[PDB]
């Protein structure tokens, strides 16, 4: 069925729907409301509620104003990411990333959540900047927000390190920190990824003690377990 | 030099490198290495960058230089005085550095006193990234088993990288992508 | 500008702000010298490999230095310059190859 191998390669490497059925479901994945309203939630009220939460966030913290200009304007209310060019898309991705790194501080707050919901239902951040959002939500991995995001995540879109959350997607309960650390011990790539994320944040001077405590704890337990693996007895393999 | 005109680059037994305009048969420039304790240039190769060369001294440093400004660009304590780097090759792909496989600037260095090849990631300040330990058989003077590594090429544009040694063996190795690989895996061999 | 600010606000309101959204998204001398390369020139159009590096449909005979600059341009367009072409105790420790013996 080598044909079918090729085709499913393409079809999960898709980025835009083309039958109405996959369109409706792709629109109905969302965080706050239910699918059976989010289907026919049109593109004003989404911007309405989310911009309200955005105002709350901007009055709390200062440096959100360029994101106000560029990612929440009324033309952004209908920009269709699906039809720009690649370098545009990447610049957009950079803007997306920096916004996530700033917002992940105030994550237990409803206006922040609303802001991310805007990002998802418009730019499909969960589909096209998957690894970043999963990265910036991993620190809060015990919370109802994380489980809901876990629900709406697209499976084959999950980055290759983070694929290990699939049985939790099959069973919508949050994973616990021991599960995370065990995958962290086995792989180098997940640990490299978490460290590179949080390094990007603190390079950006956007870190915060919860995230740093998270990262330190996970790195420490991972390195403990890794030396537990690397012990050999045999001189050369230990070296 | 990839884009220079009728110039060849020769190295000396002394640590010097001499640029020769081969058109009229004229020595046109000579260059010297920093910290003259490094003795003899062992191997040299032009980078994918512009005007940028890798000289390798027996004394242990590699160096890469702007061969028209004669300013050091990177310096590497890259061989021992016992183990001199004797053939290198740069990857020309576009991806493979910065601990995420996305960035470029990877190079491979080889001696002939060992059989283990080494991969640097150039990007921040030129860190090491890995060692294909014992690609060929490790050479030994007391042992009947021949060893030692002849040359390494990163073939252009592709992440394959061909090695051969003394011990009648030609192997080829490749980086994957979706697991990032520090050290490659073997994807042909003939022995 | 010859426009009023509230008029531009209207232009925002009804025509949209598409282009401005796009813009808001998109917010060593040579040590040695040669003489013979000055002395050289080359028939570009007479070459076929070197046809693609001219400027107009008039350049055929170009001096060595300029020809070289064209060649460097084509090297750039063919293989763009990597960014590493543009101290810490531990980073030095990493970058030293002597700290990896067995």
């Amino acid at each position: 069925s080598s044909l079918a191998q090729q085709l499913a390669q393409i079809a999960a490497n898709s980025r835009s729907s083309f039958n109405v059925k996959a369109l409706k479901a792709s629109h109905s994945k969302s965080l706050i409301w239910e699918p059976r309203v989010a289907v026919s939630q049109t593109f004003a009220e989404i911007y309405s509620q989310c911009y309200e939460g955005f105002k709350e966030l901007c009055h709390l913290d200062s440096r959100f104003v360029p994101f106000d200009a560029t990612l929440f304007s009324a033309q952004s209310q209908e920009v269709d990411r699906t039809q720009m060019t690649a370098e545009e898309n990447a610049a957009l991705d950079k803007r997306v990333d920096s916004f996530l790194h700033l917002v992940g501080s105030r994550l237990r707050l409803m206006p922040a959540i609303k802001a991310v919901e805007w990002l998802i239902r418009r730019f499909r951040i969960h589909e096209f900047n998957t690894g970043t959002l999963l990265a910036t939500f991993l620190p809060y991995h015990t919370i109802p927000a994380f489980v809901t995001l876990l629900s709406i995540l697209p499976v084959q879109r999950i980055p290759i390190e983070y694929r290990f959350l699939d049985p939790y997607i099959k069973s919508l309960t949050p994973p616990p920190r021991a599960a995370i650390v065990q995958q962290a011990t086995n792989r180098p790539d997940l640990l490299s990824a978490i460290s590179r994320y949080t390094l990007d944040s603190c390079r950006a001077k956007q870190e915060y003690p919860g995230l740093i405590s998270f990262w330190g704890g996970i790195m420490a337990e991972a390195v403990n377990g890794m030396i537990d693996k690397m012990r050999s007895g045999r001189r050369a393999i230990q070296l | 030099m990839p884009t220079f005109l009728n110039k060849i680059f020769v190295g000396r037994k002394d640590g010097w490198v001499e640029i020769w305009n081969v058109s009229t048969g004229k020595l046109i420039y000579t260059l010297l290495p920093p910290s003259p304790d490094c003795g003899a240039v062992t191997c040299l190769q032009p980078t994918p960058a512009l005007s940028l060369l890798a000289i390798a001294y027996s004394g242990g440093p590699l160096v890469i230089q702007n061969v028209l400004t004669d300013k050091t660009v990177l310096l590497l304590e890259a061989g021992t005085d016992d183990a001199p780097v004797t053939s290198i090759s740069f990857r020309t792909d576009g991806l493979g550095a910065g601990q995420d496989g996305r960035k470029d600037g990877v190079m491979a260095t080889a001696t002939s006193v060992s059989g283990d090849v080494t991969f640097w990631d150039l990007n921040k300040g030129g860190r090491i990234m890995g060692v294909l330990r014992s690609a060929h058989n490790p050479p030994s003077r007391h042992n009947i088993v021949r060893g030692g590594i002849s040359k390494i090429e990163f073939l252009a544009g592709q992440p394959v990288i061909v090695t051969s040694g003394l011990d009648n063996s030609l192997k080829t190795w490749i980086f994957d992508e979706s697991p990032f690989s520090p050290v490659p895996r073997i994807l042909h061999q003939r022995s | 500008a010859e426009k009023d600010a509230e008029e531009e606000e209207l232009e925002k309101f009804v025509l949209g702000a598409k282009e401005t959204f796009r813009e808001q998204l998109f917010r060593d001398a040579p040590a040695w010298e040669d003489s013979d390369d000055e002395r050289l020139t080359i028939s570009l159009a007479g070459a076929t490999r070197l046809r693609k590096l001219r400027i107009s449909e008039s350049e055929d005979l170009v001096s060595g230095i300029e020809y070289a600059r064209r060649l460097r341009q084509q090297y750039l367009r063919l293989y763009p310059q990597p960014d590493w072409a543009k101290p810490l105790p531990l980073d030095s420790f990493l970058r030293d190859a002597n700290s990896f013996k067995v």
Binding site: - | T92, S178, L187 | -
Partner: peptide, 22 residues
């Protein structure tokens, strides 16, 4: 299984031919 690598495809790569340093 994810993470196990694909075929080896020779990638269509153009390099700088160097027979023009005359």
């Amino acid at each position: 299984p994810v993470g196990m690598p694909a075929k080896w495809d020779v990638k269509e790569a153009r390099k700088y031919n160097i027979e023009a340093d005359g």
